[PDB]
Amino acid sequence: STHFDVIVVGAGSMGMAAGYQLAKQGVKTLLVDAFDPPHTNGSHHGDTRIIRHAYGEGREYVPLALRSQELWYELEKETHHKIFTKTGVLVFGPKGESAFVAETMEAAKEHSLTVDLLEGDEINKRWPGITVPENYNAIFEPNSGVLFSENCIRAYRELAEARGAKVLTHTRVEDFDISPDSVKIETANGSYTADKLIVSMGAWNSKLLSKLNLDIPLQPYRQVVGFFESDESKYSNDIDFPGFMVEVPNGIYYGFPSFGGCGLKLGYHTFGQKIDPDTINREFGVYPEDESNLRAFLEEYMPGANGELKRGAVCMYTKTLDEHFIIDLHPEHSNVVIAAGFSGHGFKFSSGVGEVLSQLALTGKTEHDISIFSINRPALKESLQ
């Protein structure tokens, strides 16, 4: 008995931000989620998320990063939940041996971003606790920081619901029926129709997009993080230890300073187990690599933060072949919006993406340049069934 203006399937990082943007405009919105966001079964938990502006994955992301940062500052002012801490973000790697570092530097130059460049011992001297070889160089971004992701989703949800948005929890959408002038979703708890549909199922996009006649290579990965007892006089946010994403011989690692003494948090970015979102083992430590890959980095670069494992978490990345997002209209249905393949680095942009999804759903267009996220790009290898 209840039609909606817009239905959002998957009320996570991207869907809830879209829900907030829609509700803010008086658009009657229904958000449906398999669980109760924020939760620990998707890609948004683990407390913290890094947001960077000079983008090593590609300078073309800068505008969205800057717009997202401003939207995060707006969210901070609207809710009592803590949204962002300006820890700054340090990026480093072997000189001349890191495309990531190199593109971060180019992006900063190209967009006139405020950053400090340093190398070797200067890194170790500036931040006691970091020990890198002398042939390493770095780019520090002081105005970048850390987002409290679960707080963001919770805030976007409270605000959207305050404005009339309805969130149907613990309801897994199983199929879609799309027509030229309306959309319909099917769930065990009933079916619903609307004029527009936004699909942002995270890891499950790799399993249910075929229900929309889409065939896109999307690979879910098991990605763990660990919190370690650390020397608080060095790794605390209070003494300005930064968030970071760095590149060493064996891959990319990212981390956060200890907040309130909860310990430095670390994650290995370039390695993960290919899994299925419905059978993944969410227990940290079941694979020897979970803990060993982290300490391997710590004992070498942040030895004072290699103490007792205080906590672990298991979460998921959903990768595309080129590792760029998919934000576009469904090729066969202009009334359906797709948001997928955030490949492990999309949370920082979720506020910005929420805005883009809203525009796409309401107008079929967006003011942002989102061509690099086109669902029709060749590097994606997309097709219809």
Residue nearest to ligand FAD (CB): 12
Q: Is 132 annotated as a binding residue?
A: no
Residue 326 and residue 380 in contact, taking contact as beta carbons nearer than 8 Å: yes
CB of 204 to ligand FAD, least distance (A): 3
Range 146-161 burial, b when 16+ CB lie within 10 A, else e: bbbbbbbbbbbbebbb
Cβ proximity to Cl ion: between 61 and 92 the closer is 61
CB of 17 to Cl ion, least distance (A): 15
DSSP H/E element including 119: strand 116-119
Contact between 317 and Cl ion per CB under 5 A: yes
49 is catalytic: yes
| Cα distances (angstroms) measured from residue 80 to each of 37, 77, 192, 350 | 18, 8, 33, 19
CB of 203 to Cl ion, least distance (A): 8
48 is catalytic: yes
**242 contact choice in ligand FAD, Cl ion, none (CB below 5 to 8 Å, kind-dependent):** none
CB of 43 to Cl ion, least distance (A): 5
Catalytic residue from among 67, 157, 315, 324: 315
Residue 112 and residue 157 in contact, taking contact as beta carbons nearer than 8 Å: no
Interface with Cl ion (CB under 5 A), residue from 325, 342, 349, 373 = 342
Cβ proximity to Cl ion: between 44 and 234 the closer is 44
Q: Is 5 annotated as a binding residue?
A: yes
CA-based R_g, the chain, Å: 21
Q: Is 82 annotated as a binding residue?
A: no
315 is catalytic: yes
Catalytic residue from among 184, 269, 282, 295: 269
Sign of CA dihedral 46, 50, 56, 61: positive
Residue 264 and residue 257 in contact, taking contact as beta carbons nearer than 8 Å: yes
Q: Is 239 annotated as a binding residue?
A: no
β-partners of residue 49 are 147
333 is catalytic: no
**380 contact choice in ligand FAD, Cl ion, none (CB below 5 to 8 Å, kind-dependent):** none
Sign of CA dihedral 227, 230, 232, 236: negative
**Distance separating alpha carbons of residues 333 and 14, to the nearest angstrom:** 20
Q: Is 337 annotated as a binding residue?
A: no
Q: Which residues bind ligand FAD (CB under 6 A)?
A: 9-15, 32-35, 37, 42-44, 46, 49-50, 172-173, 200-202, 204, 208, 223, 225, 254, 267, 315-317, 342, 344-348
CB of 158 to Cl ion, least distance (A): 24
Residue 325 and residue 343 in contact, taking contact as beta carbons nearer than 8 Å: yes
Cβ proximity to Cl ion: between 43 and 351 the closer is 43
**Distance separating alpha carbons of residues 207 and 218, to the nearest angstrom:** 9
265 is catalytic: yes
Cβ proximity to ligand FAD: between 60 and 122 the closer is 60
Q: Is 105 annotated as a binding residue?
A: no
Cβ proximity to ligand FAD: between 50 and 91 the closer is 50
Q: How many CB atoms lie within 10 A of CB 5?
A: 16
SS3 239: helix
**Distance separating alpha carbons of residues 302 and 131, to the nearest angstrom:** 6
Q: Is 379 annotated as a binding residue?
A: no
Q: What distance, in Å, lies between the first and last C-alpha atoms of the chain?
A: 32
CB of 181 to ligand FAD, least distance (A): 23
Q: Is 349 annotated as a binding residue?
A: no
Contacts of 96 (CB under 8 A, 6+ apart): none
Stretch in the footprint of Cl ion (CB under 5 A) among 42-50, 101-109, 290-298, 350-358: 42-50
**254 contact choice in ligand FAD, Cl ion, none (CB below 5 to 8 Å, kind-dependent):** ligand FAD
Q: For residue 309, give the nearest of 284, 289, 286 by alpha carbon.
A: 284
Count the residues in the chain: 385
Give the residue numbers annotated as catalytic, written as ranges: 45, 48-49, 265, 269, 315, 348
Binding-site residues, please? 5-35
Binding site for Cl ion (CB under 5 A): 43, 317-318, 342, 344
Binding-site residues for FAD, please? 5-35
